[PDB]
């Protein structure tokens, strides 16, 4: 089975190994599309304490294709990790980062106490809002929240609050108050052709042997030998007159190999009459002595 060279990997490294994460009130989103779904760095990172999927099991996620994958990146407290899920309520689930209750995808989180703390007040969350968020809504307004009946007129005061509060993230905080880096990978399948598929490894290509072949999406057989054909830059394989693949351009080498059938032919016994001799010779018709 032959696959093309694996290039243009999906930027999971950039999302998970990021220098900085956004505040939960203003979570970042990166679009992942038209790339290879290489999750090997997420298979056993050791550092991930939380790994749960609402879409499909992670052991199938690596094979099946999607049209779009979105990476939502933010920092929350350890006790807030519970809220990054379908069916949840709370200050994060309702005012900072809302998932669909029918959400498909995976939530991954890890302790970042040695990365995102010192206090580190660069991480903020929404404490006040008039109503909750819609799924994947990002409310980054700084307008003063009016809790009372008296107009705030743009400033804080009695029953008037700045809607975004900072976290006192410190290296000496208890675990529930330490910062955690959360990446949510939102996965969808549309009517559109899927573009984000898992990587597949190629089998060593062997010439001059009778083999079952699979080149990209084309199933073949027979024996491959060096071709003297020149294909146009966009062509992947060629054909003979009777709807038969004649040659294939290999996905990795860009070399073309001709396809011959595995040797076959009738078997004939050449004999004198049994009246004078029981000695026989055997003729393998239309084949090579190296195949018999």
């Amino acid at each position, epitope marked *: 089975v032959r696959f093309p060279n694996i290039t243009n990997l999906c930027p999971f490294g950039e999302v998970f190994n990021a220098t900085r994460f956004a505040s939960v009130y203003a979570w970042n989103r990166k679009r992942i599309s038209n790339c290879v779904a290489d999750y090997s760095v997420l298979y*056993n990172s050791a550092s991930f304490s939380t790994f749960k*999927c609402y*879409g499909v099991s992670p052991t199938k996620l690596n094979d099946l294709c999607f049209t779009n994958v979105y990476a939502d990146s933010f920092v929350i407290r350890g006790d807030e990790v519970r809220q990054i899920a379908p*069916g949840q309520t709370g200050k994060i689930a309702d005012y900072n980062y809302k998932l669909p209750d*029918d959400f498909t995808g995976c939530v991954i989180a890890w302790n970042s106490n040695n990365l995102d703390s010192k206090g580190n007040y660069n991480y903020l969350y929404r404490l006040f809002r008039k109503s909750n968020l819609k799924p994947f809504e990002r409310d980054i307004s700084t307008e003063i929240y009016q809790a009372g009946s008296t107009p705030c007129n743009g400033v804080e005061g009695f029953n008037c609050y700045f809607p975004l509060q900072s976290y006192g993230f410190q290296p000496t905080n208890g675990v529930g108050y330490q910062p955690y880096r959360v990446v949510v990978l939102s996965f969808e399948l549309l009517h559109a052709p899927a573009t984000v598929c898992g990587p597949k490894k190629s089998t060593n290509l062997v010439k001059n042997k009778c083999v079952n072949f699979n080149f990209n999406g084309l199933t073949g057989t027979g024996v491959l030998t060096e071709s003297n054909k020149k294909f146009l830059p966009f062509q992947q394989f060629g054909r003979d007159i009777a709807d038969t693949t004649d040659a294939v351009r290999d996905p990795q080498t860009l070399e073309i190999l001709d396809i011959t059938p595995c040797s076959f032919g009738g078997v004939s016994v050449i004999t004198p009459g049994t009246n004078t001799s029981n000695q026989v010779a055997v003729l393998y018709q239309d084949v090579n002595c190296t195949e018999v």
Partner: antibody
Amino acid sequence: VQLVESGGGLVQPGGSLRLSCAASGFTFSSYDMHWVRQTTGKGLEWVSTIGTAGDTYYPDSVKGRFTISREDAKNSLYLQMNSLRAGDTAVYYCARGDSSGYYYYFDYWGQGTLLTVSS
Amino acid sequence: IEMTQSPSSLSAAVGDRVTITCRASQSIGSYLNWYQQKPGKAPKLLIYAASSLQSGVPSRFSGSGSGTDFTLTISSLQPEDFAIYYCQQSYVSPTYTFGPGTKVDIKR
């Protein structure tokens, strides 16, 4: 398809047990293998999994105590359970997972083996 | 996610229709599996993905449901269907969990 558990027996609290499961009738290397346990008074619980990519997952009560491994060359599944507690007494089973589209289910189980933890 | 089954014990005669319900603490879409475990035996898969019947499962078995409320149905209970039945949420992986189980007894 057949699945046969072994390695069950008596262990003290604070000790360890090594379980195994023989895989036959299927391409073991192509399937996600799981362990589950059935505890009297609680019902059937999932314990661990190992994928074909070598990835592993555990529930929070197990993380850090149990290690799951597989030897594809021998069609044999293993679970090394250390730091055992009395609450780990259960019948442990090996199982094969499978799927249809985006839906996952368990399809095959062995007969299970009983693990008893007591001083 | 937690699953609750009802009744904990179902009493029905051979030939009776048997219905077992399972409720999710939150929506699980159509991601629910059902299993049948005979005494002294490991569980068998009956229904997966809410309503898909598994091969090898008698046509007497069917079921449906979505969101939080699901039901398994046996059109006509047989003596061999004396078993403990379980529902399993499959929405949240890797931590697959089962409900408390419904024991189906033969009514006399």
